[PDB]
Design a protein around this ligand. Sequence first.
Ligand SMILES: [Mg+2]
Ligand SMILES: [Mg+2]
Ligand SMILES: [Mg+2]
Ligand SMILES: [Mg+2]
Ligand SMILES: [Mg+2]
Lengths: 95, 52, 107, 41, 95, 83, 49, 49
Amino acid sequence: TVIVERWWKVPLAGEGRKPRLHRRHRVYKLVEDTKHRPKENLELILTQSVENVGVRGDLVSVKKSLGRNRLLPQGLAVYASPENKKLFEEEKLLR
Amino acid sequence: KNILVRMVSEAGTGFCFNTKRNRLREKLTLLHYDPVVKQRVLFVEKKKIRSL
Amino acid sequence: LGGKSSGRRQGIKKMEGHYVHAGNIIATQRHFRWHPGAHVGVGKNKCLYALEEGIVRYTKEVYVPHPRNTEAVDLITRLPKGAVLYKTFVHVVPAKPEGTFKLVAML
Amino acid sequence: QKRREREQHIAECMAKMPQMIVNWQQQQRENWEKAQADKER
Amino acid sequence: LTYFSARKGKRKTVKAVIDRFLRLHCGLWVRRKAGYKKKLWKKTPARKKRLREFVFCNKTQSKLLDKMTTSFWKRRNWYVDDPYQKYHDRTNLKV
Amino acid sequence: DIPLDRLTISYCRSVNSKAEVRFHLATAEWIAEPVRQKIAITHKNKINRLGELILTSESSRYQFRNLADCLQKIRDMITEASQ
Amino acid sequence: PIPKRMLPPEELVPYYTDAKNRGYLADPAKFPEARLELARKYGYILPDI
Amino acid sequence: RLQYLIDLGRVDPSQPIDLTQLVNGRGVTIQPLKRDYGVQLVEEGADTF
RNA sequence: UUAAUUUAUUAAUGCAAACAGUAACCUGCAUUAAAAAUUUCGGUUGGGGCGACCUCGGAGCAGAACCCAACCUCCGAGCAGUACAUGCUAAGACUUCACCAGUCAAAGCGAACCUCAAUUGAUCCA
Ligand SMILES: [Mg+2]
Ligand SMILES: [Mg+2]
Ligand SMILES: [Mg+2]
Ligand SMILES: [Mg+2]
Ligand SMILES: [Mg+2]
């Protein structure tokens, strides 16, 4: 994904009006890319003990690739949704 | 041969004036009038500002 | 090749008998085609100007240079023993008197 | 505050100065002397 | 100078003039002398002084400027403490 | 200080108007005796043959301003007399 | 509906909070003092209102 | 100007002189577009008031 | 094209992004190439070309208030030196035939007790 700042300034047109645009408003200047960004980490609840990377029942911050192409498809983990979190807590308590 | 230089007053700070001096010789110190202070005061050379 | 310089527009700006106010330039020159006389000044160009309100007059007056100015002195020394140099001088002859006493009040 | 600070600085400078000027004068004199000496040689 | 604009069909102002000059209500045009913030070292003090003054434009120049602007820049403006306010109106003329 | 029933103010338009403020100096009880004496000594030029300290002022087009100026003058004089 | 008017923006606030220019947010204890001062300056007597 | 208005009947000094009243009288025409911020009282008829 | 500005196309690379593991194919940003693409080709001139010149100043033509040309005749300049009140301001003038640029300058307030012929360059931008 590319974020593209618009050079040349759209001249500001009303509440309920489209602002017509010019072939110089078509000129852009890319401010940032979503790529070339600090890689973030995703939260997952583990349904199974995995190696040293996760303890069963616990909520861990994983590398996103690992989450998306291994853990989630293989039923080894689930998203940090508030829904199932409660359930997991309950399970822990029971244990 | 000659350098342009800025000269900064010690008393009556903020007032700077531009003068000539030969490139080969000493950093310049000079008595000169500050219209802020309204008295003559020593200026000291600081930063050359083009050479010629 | 060479230079083609514009005309300099120098010369007399005010002639004898003209009414010339303080500040009016009287004559502009390079070198002294005229010299400053009574109530007439000299700018850095050698340009002559009126120092008071009045009338311009021209006169041929005996010229004595300043002692400190060397070249003139030398010239003077060179001249024979009954010679006097002479030069043209521009004067303003002032018209309106500087002062008039007026009655302010009876105290 | 701004007015005070700059003003204070200025005052300080003024206080300093009288002797600074003297020093400068002395330096100038010294320089002159040196020049004279050089000329003599 | 766009005697008729595209959308409104009104005359436009050449904004250069507006940037550079001050129209007094009497219709004098005041300008900063050119070459006044430049090469001030080589210039003699008198020259500097001359260059730091404002100046009134020639009649022809004034006329040109009037043509170049719209009637908005010629209106009476009652500013609180504009330093030029006293020069807008003219006193004691005679031909 | 300066109660205005003591003073004699007279106007004169001529744009610059003129406001003649005037009063008998020696008999003015509102001015102190030594102060009065001092005033007499100093501003004798302003005082009339009759014995009235006249100090007119002209500067503004409105007479009020002139009057104010005149008033201020008296105050200034008093101050001077004091020290 | 008839709206509520807004206050001085920023640099008009010191104007209208002083009683020497009869400001509508200025403290009315000082108004009389101001009046007195004015009277002292420009002659004439304050008519008691 | 104010004095004149008073004399002429328009602008009643028995009521308060608000901007609105003045406008009604048609002493002071003002225009919010072109950024007028109301009337300013001026010294021009200082005496003879 | 070995004139300028560009590389959006193709070119490989390089770094990201995607990837896998263990003790390639695609997108984004950089790179230098190839290929192209916009583009313009100043004036004076005894036709044009070639050669020379193109701004400023002094002298002659232009003999006596200014002004006055030529690819007419002759000199030069594109700086120095001294200061560091080459501080502030200000009546009144001159002006290179417009404008822009230049010049002179009484008084006043501050202080003491400029030389030089030419010696330079607007606006916007930095
Ligand atoms: Mg609308
Ligand atoms: Mg040609
Ligand atoms: Mg030929
Ligand atoms: Mg001319
Ligand atoms: Mg003087």
